[PDB]
Design a binder for this molecule. Structure first.
Ligand code: CDL
Ligand code: PLX
Ligand code: PEE
Ligand code: NDP
Ligand code: SF4
Ligand code: SF4
Ligand code: SF4
Ligand code: ZN
Lengths: 297, 29, 176, 379, 144, 63, 156, 115, 56, 208, 96
């Protein structure tokens, strides 16, 4: 199995895990954690970056000498994608944008780019492809965000039959846009939210790479508890000791989180989901100058 | 043949080197 | 023998006391320091206009490493591994094997320039003048990996700097 | 009484203040502990030599000389006369470098900052001599346990004489800036006074002894290389304060100039290392033409020389004080133990007593007058 | 006196080829001194000497406008000096390569290169030894 | 003044070694064999304690 | 059209302002700091390039790690690095900071400061001469001249 | 015979008394440390960690070893009281960033050559 | 130093000492960078006879 | 004796031998052995219980008055029952002389601290506790001085690994510096340099 | 004499070249692979064989002290040519 791809060492920084991962969109919120988890076990990471290298400067300490290679690419171009995934045996797609741009709308970000990545990964002989899309992604959605997410899911499934699709819902992390977004507001009682910890999603992606029978499966990474939006925002404002983006985001946050009991979740990957209360203090300690919100199950 | 040549002080040594403190007085009562 | 630095007894007559009082009240020594600084302002500075002028160096100066070769063009290194054994920082890794013609040559010769301390022990333990520490010092790098030299890099360095490397060795080999 | 932490050489200092006063001072060291003494046990003596440049990285050749003297004493060999004269010459040059560093950085911490540049020009010149004689500006590794690595290039002595004949006015400009200045005196006079008995008991050495009136110097009392063949005076303080130690260091600069002149005039001819190819390597030509020379070069640069078993404590008068090494050899080419004694350790230990009932700003003056380089403190 | 120093300033301006060359050297080297030309480089570098200046400023180089592959009108560095002029410029010798040139060898580079860090031409380390342990290759003919 | 305790000495808790490097390692106490390439016998005088060989692998960079 | 031209001109002006005023803070950890102080000396005059001498941690632009980083010292280094504003660049000076150097196989030494902070320029030597540190600073200046933030923002 | 020079205690009762004293001191310090260093753990978790660190040495039967361990424990307690330690040092007790090393035979057989 | 006489007088008066006698900038008075070959005499034990190693 | 051999001094040898015999006569309760090196270095081996008396005598006696403590260190010899060897180096300015006092201890037996005799010993003793684990009794403040806070083990013991057990890096997941089991990209090459054909017949040992 | 690998890479003088399936080639994409063009084996192959009329010859590599240790080469075997162990030069007796 290409002997140089055999794991060696003790799973440390200088060890060899046999994983050669190309992580598209690694300069994001989830990309940094994925690259950290991949590099701390000794895997080789190719980081394809669109921005200036200064914005990729923080990824360098995450791996040992030569374990992280940074490469320029363009989403509109197929040759760059081809040359970035030439030698990888794992490809992870984390490309996403929450708003509109005069160069990239939702269809290019969530449909065209994932389709190109999947097609080139299949033509290049990549063994594993991992794709990330929203939990509430449905074709019949009012929002173009989640409609494009669903179309991208279908198209990447068509292009890469053995692709693993992950559908995380409202991940909350130190550098997230869920707890910070609510804490920066300084409407509900019918909408329910099911937030998932950033580290849980990172470990889920890592295990899905490791898991042998998670080839064509579809996962839904969700947290331990379902929260009404009003009391969740109340708890967010209470933890920060505080008294209580154009159109798509408010529509998305007003939508309730779906429930998909038939799909496997984090439990299938041997991960105990972390409740929000434990990490809420960690996230919101920086918004300052106990009575956790009630849940529904 | 060749005669020994290495770094040596010149004949008669070097010139005197001043090392005492020299703090002059400008002069006004 | 020994000296006393601060056992000078000031005079207590009226003239010395008046001089000390005038020094205290009119700040003579502070103005004296001002005069010294003013004098230093009016003399030529010691600055050189880098990178157009360069600081003086000598043939003994030791900077970036290089692997040399004979005038025929065949590399001097015979894989004796004395430079590897003498290296205080363990910055040299060597692997050898017989060549196609049976020559004793290295198939791997790496120097970790982030481990090297630039002591010059390697170039003085070499019996065949193969490894030298040349006069280049402007080889700063944007990544850690490019400071990990292999045999090809050192051979290219030797081919690149051979002219003045040989000139310096000619100038300094009688002291060795 | 509040406890405050002056954190990040690099030093962490835990002090309790009752208003302006200092009640307890606690230096926390180990921020530059690299484990040099343990790493030496894994090297041969020649491989262990370059560690001493990095020990006290302001006075390099003095550490080289102390290590070389210890290894010579254990090996039962002596260096040739020209090697000894070169050693004393470069030791005095190193003393000049160290004292410039100490005085200029002390004044810079006080706030003067002009003599720093004035004298770092001369430091750069002295650096050129190191570069010319060895090929490295700072960590030369020139002085070896058998003598010196190489002989002087043909033009070095003239340039040393030309540099040393103009240095007196540089010291004089420094003294104009600092010696008679009233602000400098009020910053340093009657600060950090230590009595002779307390300085002696606490393990002080160098100026910390001489500043308190104790007439002690290792170059005079226990001379090592050729220091008994040169004449110089030893400045002695009277009050034990920072001002007296500053004066002592300046007068040491002048006496070092005197010794440098004497060393230039009396340089003898001859070889540079012990003519015993089982300790010092043969010349390159001899190695390339003779069989015994090649065998000895091979064995010395792969295994090294075997030192007879025994333990020694060899100390020299480094510019910072008594610098010593306790070297234990089990009979192989790899030292069994190498304890390194630096005066900075004892001086920083005495810092707590030295700063009783002083201002917060006086602690900087005391640290400066101790001249603490944390490479030798932490080792 | 003052008239003499102003006269030497005017001669200094005139010795750079007029006002355009004076301004060019002022904006490229931040220095407008004039010295005797020691030699010319194959890449366009010029080398000047003035023994009346103190040690360190008695030798200098004006870098070329265009080196191997980029415009170095503004982007200059000390790695553009070829080894022979490197030895002369750093005062390792008193003899420029013009008076006596270095020995010529068939393996010495004919075209000096600069420090290529942060460039597609940068050095990438790799292992130079071959594969140590050879795996077994199963036969392609079925066993039964 | 004297405890006069009767128990076998064991300083394991005071050395700072990790727990896995104590009950899993196997030291070997031996007099090293003479190198047959040489006839000298000065390296066969003392006893040596050495640990068992563990895994060594090739670095992906620089090998 | 005109938008890309104007954004490129603004980007060039911002880069020129940034690289013409570099305010460094230096950890005088070990011997390499001495050579740092020789770059500030009259002969080299790091000030004449617009690079001030001993800026404060609050308004520092570039970080020079000049010496050996130990296990007892790494958290302090990272804490100081996190304090720096805006665009911050790190320069690793000497073998000890680059990859551990002569104390690489030591129980109390961090094997390279790039385990703790991201490094932009690696200056090799033991110690690097003030010439070499000046060369590294000028190389960092050229690298800053190369970067292009506003053009990427426009094409984003 | 087997007679040795004491350090602080003469028999196991005094050593046990000193161990109880040290445990009381650490137990009282846990919440103050958790608040002061701005921890991410709870006080119950910190006291559980203290209990685990104590139980790690529960097999010692030598009063000299026990009271030397007690001396060390007071040393780290003194380090923690005076905030000599940074936030990182306190965590070094929890190994939060290390991957879980399995103990069963099959897992060790699969992962590597390590026994 | 190529300094005008008036500037030399001003600097000498301000410092109080004659600066031109001993300047801190190095000039043609230094030694040449290219030197003749040396010879470097041999040590005392380079004899051909009566030089048995057991005696030294 | 040619210029390649370090000359011997016999006057100092005899003086040091006489003074060592003098110290031995005065303090027979503690002194176990006295030696003089071939390079005129006097060392005294004493029982551990006599650290405070003997040192005090050497500090306070009119003939000795060794007022300065040059250095205090420990040497680790694992093959001995008493593992650690405590060495005191003393300097006498009145007589321009140096002496060495040597003592033995093990992992569990403490040593009386000589802070009451020499203040300089204070920090030195701390270092020993930090580097060898030797406990010093009646010390004003005994704690680590060189190693990192919470460092487990004493690095200068001969059985401590050269590279230690843990190494430090930065983790962005926890946003802090963490410690992990040590893994080296290049393991330290161990060189067998000891040669057969012993060098010094003067130090030969009986073949038991 | 620098050869080219079947993939397209350059093979060094030691015979090193990543094969088709080796992932490590990714380190060279968008960058360059450092290969020395001057091969010592080819350069020493083209040297002329020196003719001396003595049964034993001496070789120090040329340059005296700037070469390699002096060695002596026997030329009795007329079948082949005596080769210096250090320099790689060849010597041979004037047969016929
Ligand atoms: C006060 C009025 C200013 C006059 C002045 O500065 O003359 C300096 C003139 C030169 O004195 P110096 O520094 O000892 O001589 C240096 C060399 O001669 C310098 O000679 P050089 O060969 O380097 O020539 C360089 C030349 C040209 O150099 C330049 O390009 C710089 C001039 C730009 C000035 C704006 O400098 C000048 O001629 C202009 C000097 C400043 C006048 C404006 O001094 C006087 O004339 C005495 C004035 C007394 C003041 C107290
Ligand atoms: C009053 C209104 C102000 C509005 C805001 C503007 C701020 C103040 C306006 C002043 C602008 C100053 C620009 C002048 C800088 C040119 C410097 C030039 O000489 O440098 C050279 C030219 O380099 C670059 O090619 C030039 C880039 C400068 C920017 C070009 C003009 C941009 C101005 C746009 C202003 C519009 C403002 C709109 C918002 C209000 C290269 O030097 P460098 O490489 O460094 O150093 C190399 C070292 N050497 C010399 C020894 C070899
Ligand atoms: C003596 C005179 C001194 C004058 C006083 C100082 C005046 C300063 C003048 C400022 C000039 C304009 C600065 C413009 C550049 C600002 C810095 C910059 O490049 O920001 C780029 C930044 C990068 O962000 P991202 O790539 O999207 O995300 C990466 C992080 N996740 O993108 C932007 O924000 C672009 C902002 C729009 C700029 C367009 C107009 C430029 C300003 C005109 C002048 C306005 C003020 C007058
Ligand atoms: N709360 C959350 O964040 C959860 C995220 N989603 C999905 O998870 C994925 C990653 O999330 P997250 O890391 O937070 O998103 P980020 O906003 O942090 O960045 C996503 C990455 O994709 C790259 N990227 C974005 N747009 C483009 C583009 N048009 N062309 C090229 N590259 C682009 C970005 O690089 P650059 O710096 O150049 O812009 C960036 O590195 C996304 O696909 C998202 O849809 C799943 C549930 C919610
Ligand atoms: S210069 Fe010294 S440290 Fe560097 S490779 Fe040579 S021997 Fe090793
Ligand atoms: S470089 Fe010299 S010392 Fe090193 S292996 Fe080659 S021939 Fe031997
Ligand atoms: S060894 Fe080199 S890098 Fe380390 S402190 Fe000394 S000079 Fe600096
Ligand atoms: Zn030959």
């Amino acid at each position: 199995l290409h002997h140089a791809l055999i794991p060696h060492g003790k799973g440390g920084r200088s060890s060899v895990s046999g994983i050669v991962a190309t992580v598209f969109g690694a300069t994001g919120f989830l990309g940094r954690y994925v690259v950290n988890h991949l590099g701390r076990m000794g895997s080789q990471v190719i980081v394809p970056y669109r921005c200036e290298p200064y914005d990729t400067m923080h990824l360098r300490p995450m791996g040992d000498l030569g374990q992280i290679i940074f490469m320029e690419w363009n989403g509109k171009d197929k040759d760059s994608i081809r040359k970035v995934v030439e030698h990888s045996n794992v490809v992870i797609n984390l490309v996403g944008r929450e708003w509109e741009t005069k160069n990239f709308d939702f269809e290019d970000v969530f449909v065209k780019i994932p389709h190109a990545i999947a097609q080139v990964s299949k033509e290049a002989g990549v063994e594993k492809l991992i794709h990330i899309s929203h939990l509430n992604a449905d074709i019949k959605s009012p929002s173009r965000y989640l409609r494009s997410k669903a179309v991208g899911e279908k198209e990447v499934r068509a292009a890469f039959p053995e692709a693993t699709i992950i559908k995380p819902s409202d991940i909350f992390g130190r550098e997230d846009r869920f707890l910070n977004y609510f804490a920066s507001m300084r409407l509900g009682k019918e909408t329910v939210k099911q937030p998932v910890y950033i580290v849980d999603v990172s470990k889920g992606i890592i295990n899905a790479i490791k898991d042998p029978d998670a080839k064509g499966k579809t996962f839904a990474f969700v947290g331990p508890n379902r929260y009404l939006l009003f009391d969740l925002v109340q708890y967010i404002f209470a933890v920060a000791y505080r008294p209580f983006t154009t159109r798509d985001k408010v529509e998305r946050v007003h939508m309730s989180d779906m429930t998909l009991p038939h799909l496997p979740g984090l439990e299938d990957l041997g991960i105990q989901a972390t409740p929000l209360e434990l990490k809420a203090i960690e996230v919101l300690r920086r918004h300052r100058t106990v009575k956790p919100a009630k849940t529904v199950n | 043949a060749s005669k020994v040549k290495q770094d040596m002080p010149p004949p008669g040594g070097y010139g005197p080197i001043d090392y005492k403190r020299n703090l002059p007085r400008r002069g006004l009562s | 023998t020994y000296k006393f630095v601060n056992m000078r007894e000031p005079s207590m007559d009226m003239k010395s006391v008046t001089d000390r009082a005038a020094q205290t009240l009119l700040w003579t020594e502070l103005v004296r320091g001002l005069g010294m600084t003013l004098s230093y302002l009016f003399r030529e500075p010691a600055t050189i206009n880098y990178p157009f002028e360069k600081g003086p160096l000598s043939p003994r100066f030791r900077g970036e490493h290089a692997l040399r070769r004979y005038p025929s063009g065949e590399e001097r290194c015979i894989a004796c591994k004395l430079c590897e054994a003498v290296c205080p920082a363990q910055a040299i890794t060597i692997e050898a094997e017989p060549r196609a013609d049976g020559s004793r040559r290295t198939t791997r010769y790496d120097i970790d320039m982030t481990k090297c301390i630039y002591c010059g022990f390697c170039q003085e333990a070499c019996p065949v003048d193969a490894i030298v520490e040349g006069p280049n010092f402007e080889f700063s790098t944007e990544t850690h990996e490019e400071l990990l030299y292999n045999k090809e890099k050192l051979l290219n360095n030797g081919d690149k700097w051979e002219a003045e490397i040989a000139a310096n060795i000619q100038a300094d080999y009688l002291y060795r | 009484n509040l406890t405050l932490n002056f954190g990040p050489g690099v030093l962490r200092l835990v002090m309790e203040l009752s208003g302006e006063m200092v009640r307890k001072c606690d230096p926390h060291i180990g921020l530059l502990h690299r484990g040099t003494e343990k790493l030496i046990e894994y090297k041969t003596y020649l491989q262990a030599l370059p560690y001493f440049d990095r020990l006290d990285y302001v006075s390099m050749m003095c550490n080289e000389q102390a290590y070389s003297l210890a290894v010579e004493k254990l090996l039962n060999i002596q260096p040739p006369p020209r090697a000894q004269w070169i050693r004393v010459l470069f030791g005095e040059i190193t003393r000049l470098l160290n004292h410039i560093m100490a005085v200029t950085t002390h004044a810079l911490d006080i706030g003067a900052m002009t003599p720093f540049f004035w004298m770092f020009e001369e430091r750069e010149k002295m650096f050129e001599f190191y570069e010319r004689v060895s090929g490295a500006r700072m960590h030369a590794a020139y002085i070896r346990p058998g003598g010196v690595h190489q002989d002087l290039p043909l033009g070095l002595l003239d340039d040393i004489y030309e540099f040393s004949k103009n240095f007196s006015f540089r010291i004089d400009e420094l003294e104009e800036m600092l010696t008679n200045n009233r602000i400098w005196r009020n910053r340093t006079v009657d600060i950090g006074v230590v009595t002779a008995e307390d300085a002696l008991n606490y393990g002080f050495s160098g100026v910390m002894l001489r500043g308190s009136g104790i007439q002690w110097d290792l170059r005079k009392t226990q001379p090592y290389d050729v220091y008994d063949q040169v004449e110089f005076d030893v400045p002695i303080g009277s009050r034990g304060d920072c001002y007296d130690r500053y004066l002592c260091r300046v007068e040491e600069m002048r006496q070092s100039l005197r010794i440098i002149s004497q060393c230039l005039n009396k340089m003898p001819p001859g070889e540079i290392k012990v003519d015993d190819a089982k300790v010092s390597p043969p010349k390159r030509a001899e190695m390339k033409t003779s069989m015994e020379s090649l065998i000895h070069h091979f064995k010395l640069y792969t295994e090294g020389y075997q030192v007879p078993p025994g333990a020694t404590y060899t100390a020299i008068e480094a510019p910072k004080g008594e610098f010593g090494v306790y070297l234990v050899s089990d009979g192989s080419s790899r030292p069994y133990r190498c304890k390194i004694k630096a005066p900075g350790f004892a001086h920083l230990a005495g810092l707590d007593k030295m700063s009783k009932g002083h201002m917060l700003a006086d602690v900087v003056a005391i640290i400066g007058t101790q001249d603490i380089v944390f490479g030798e403190v932490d080792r | 006196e003052l008239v003499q120093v102003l006269r030497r300033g005017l001669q200094q301006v005139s010795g750079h080829g007029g006002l355009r060359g004076y301004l060019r050297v002022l904006f490229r080297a931040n220095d407008v001194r004039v010295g005797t030309l020691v030699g010319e480089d194959k890449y366009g570098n010029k080398y000047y000497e003035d023994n009346k200046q103190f040690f360190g400023r008695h030798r200098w180089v004006i870098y070329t406008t265009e080196m191997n592959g980029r415009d170095t009108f503004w982007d200059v560095d000390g790695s553009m000096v070829p080894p022979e002029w490197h030895r002369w410029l750093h005062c390792m010798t008193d003899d420029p390569p013009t008076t006596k040139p270095p020995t010529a060898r068939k393996y010495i580079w004919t075209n000096h290169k600069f420090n290529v860090s942060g460039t597609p031409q940068q050095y990438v380390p790799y292992s130079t030894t071959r594969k140590k342990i050879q795996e077994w290759v199963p036969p392609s003919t079925p066993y039964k | 003044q004297l405890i006069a305790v009767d128990e076998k000495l064991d300083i394991t808790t005071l050395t700072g070694v990790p727990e896995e490097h104590i009950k899993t390692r196997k030291v070997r106490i031996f007099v090293p064999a003479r190198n047959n390439m040489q006839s000298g016998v000065n390296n066969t005088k003392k006893w040596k304690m050495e640990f068992d060989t563990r895994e060594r692998w090739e670095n992906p960079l620089m090998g | 059209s005109r938008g890309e031209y104007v954004v490129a001109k603004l980007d060039d002006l911002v880069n020129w302002a940034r690289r013409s005023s570099l305010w460094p803070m230096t950890f005088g950890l070990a011997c390499c700091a001495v050579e740092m102080m020789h770059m500030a000396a009259p002969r080299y005059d790091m000030d004449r390039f617009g690079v001030v001498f001993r800026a404060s941690p609050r308004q520092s632009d570039v970080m020079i790690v000049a010496g050996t980083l130990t296990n007892k010292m790494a958290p302090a280094l990272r804490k100081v690095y996190d304090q720096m504003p805006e665009p911050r660049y790190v320069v690793s000076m000497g073998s000890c900071a680059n990859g551990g150097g002569y104390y690489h196989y030591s129980y109390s030494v961090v094997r390279g400061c790039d385990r703790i902070v991201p490094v932009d320029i690696y200056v090799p030597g033991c110690p690097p001469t003030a010439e070499a540190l000046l060369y590294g600073i000028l190389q960092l200046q050229r690298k800053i001249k190369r970067e292009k933030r506003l053009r990427i923002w426009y094409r984003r | 015979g087997t007679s040795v020079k004491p350090i602080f205690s003469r028999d196991m009762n005094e050593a046990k008394r000193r161990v109880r004293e040290l445990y009381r001191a650490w137990y009282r310090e846990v919440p103050n440390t958790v608040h002061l260093f701005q921890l991410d753990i709870s006080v119950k978790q910190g006291r559980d960690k203290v209990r685990e660190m104590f139980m790690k040495n529960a097999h010692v039967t030598d009063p000299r070893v026990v009271d030397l361990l007690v001396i060390k424990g007071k040393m780290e307690l003194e380090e923690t009281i005076n905030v000599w330690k940074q936030r990182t040092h306190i965590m070094r007790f929890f190994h939060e960033t290390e991957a879980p090393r399995p103990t069963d035979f099959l897992s060790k057989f699969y992962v590597g050559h390590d026994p | 130093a190529s300094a005008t006489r008036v500037i030399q007088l001003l600097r000498n008066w301000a410092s109080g000492r004659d600066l031109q006698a001993k300047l801190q900038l190095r000039y043609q008075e230094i030694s040449k960078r290219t030197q003749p070959p040396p010879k470097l005499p041999v040590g005392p034990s380079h004899k051909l006879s009566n030089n048995y190693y057991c005696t030294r | 004796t040619r210029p390649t051999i370090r000359p011997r001094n016999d006057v100092v040898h005899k003086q040091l031998s006489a003074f060592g015999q003098y110290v031995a006569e005065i303090l027979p309760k503690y002194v176990q052995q006295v030696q003089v090196s071939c390079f005129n270095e006097l060392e005294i081996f004493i029982h551990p219980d006599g650290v405070i008396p003997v040192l005090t005598f050497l500090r306070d006696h009119t003939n000795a008055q060794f007022k300065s403590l040059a250095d205090l260190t420990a040497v680790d010899v694992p093959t001995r029952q008493n593992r650690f060897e405590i060495v005191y180096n003393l300097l006498s300015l009145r007589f321009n002389s140096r002496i060495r006092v040597k003592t033995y201890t093990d992992e569990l037996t403490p040593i009386e601290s000589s802070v009451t005799v020499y203040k300089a010993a204070n920090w030195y003793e701390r270092e020993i506790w930090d580097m060898f684990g030797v406990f010093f009794a009646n010390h004003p403040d005994l704690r680590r001085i060189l190693t990192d806070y919470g460092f487990e083990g004493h690095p200068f013991r001969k059985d401590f690994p050269l590279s230690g057990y843990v190494e430090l890096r930065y983790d962005d997941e926890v946003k802090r510096v963490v410690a992990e089991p040590v893994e080296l990209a290049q393991e330290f090459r161990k060189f067998d340099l000891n040669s057969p054909w012993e060098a010094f017949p003067a130090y030969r040992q009986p073949p038991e | 004499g620098v050869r080219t690998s079947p993939t397209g890479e350059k093979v060094t003088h030691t015979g090193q070249a990543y094969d088709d399936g080796d992932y490590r080639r990714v380190r060279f994409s968008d960058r360059q692979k450092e290969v020395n063009e001057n091969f010592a084996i080819d350069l020493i192959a083209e040297q002329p064989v020196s003719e001396v009329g003595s049964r034993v010859i001496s070789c120090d590599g040329g340059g005296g002290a700037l070469g390699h240790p002096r060695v002596y080469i026997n030329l009795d075997k007329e079948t082949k040519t005596g080769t210096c162990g250090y320099c790689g030069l060849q010597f041979r007796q004037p047969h016929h």
